[PDB]
């Protein structure tokens, strides 16, 4: 019975905020383990006698980032014997997201793709000349396509991406794109 792992408030956060990792098993367990990759020893472990265990990371630092896994254990189990591991949880702690690239896709109407390297982000298109953004879209993919209408296409554009909700982590703006 594989447990599942969750991160609150987010999977991508700035250094200094508090992250609560939450592991849950189908039936109550005695000991929950928080593992980094390949290490037999859990970094953190909680004795709870519950189906749920919360791991509180106060003021996260870029060291607390990485791939996490949850496993549980019962008292009557062998030594170094743990349950099925949960699906991975990649926690990213950074001041800033890596800069996106803004390109035009060939096909009249014009389509742009703001591309970063991080999944689950909100992408935002800015028009050089206008303050408020032109278009914005939330995507699971590390890119988003914007469609520009025919004769409103020519101009100077740039994009940035950010986390969907607070605490926000922002990327820098892409190099401007000339149409």
């Amino acid at each position: 019975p594989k447990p599942w792992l969750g991160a609150q408030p987010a999977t991508v956060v700035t250094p200094g905020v508090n992250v609560t990792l939450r592991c849950r098993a189908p039936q109550p367990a005695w000991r929950f383990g928080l593992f980094k990759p390949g290490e037999i020893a859990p970094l953190l472990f909680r004795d709870v006698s519950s189906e749920l265990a919360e791991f509180f990371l106060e003021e996260v630092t870029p060291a607390q980032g990485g791939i996490y896994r949850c496993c549980y254990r019962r008292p009557d189990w062998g030594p170094g014997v743990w349950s099925q591991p949960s699906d991975v949880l990649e926690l990213l702690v950074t001041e800033e997201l890596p800069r996106p690239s803004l390109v035009a896709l060939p096909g009249a109407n014009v389509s742009l793709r703001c591309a970063g390297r991080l999944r689950n982000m909100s992408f935002v298109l800015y028009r050089e000349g206008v303050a408020a953004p032109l278009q914005y879209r939330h995507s699971a993919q590390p890119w988003a396509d914007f469609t520009l209408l025919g004769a409103r296409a020519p101009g100077t554009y740039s994009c940035y991406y950010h986390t969907p909700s607070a605490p926000y982590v922002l990327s820098q703006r892409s190099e401007v794109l000339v149409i």
Binding site: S122, V124, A131, A132, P133, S158, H162, P164, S165
Partner: peptide
């Protein structure tokens, strides 16, 4: 019935202005 959940996050702010020229 109860009040609905909160709305989604507001739209993103305006882009930052370029800085002054250098020394």
């Amino acid at each position: 019935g109860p009040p609905g959940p909160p709305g989604p996050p507001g739209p993103p702010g305006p882009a930052g202005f370029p800085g002054p020229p250098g020394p």
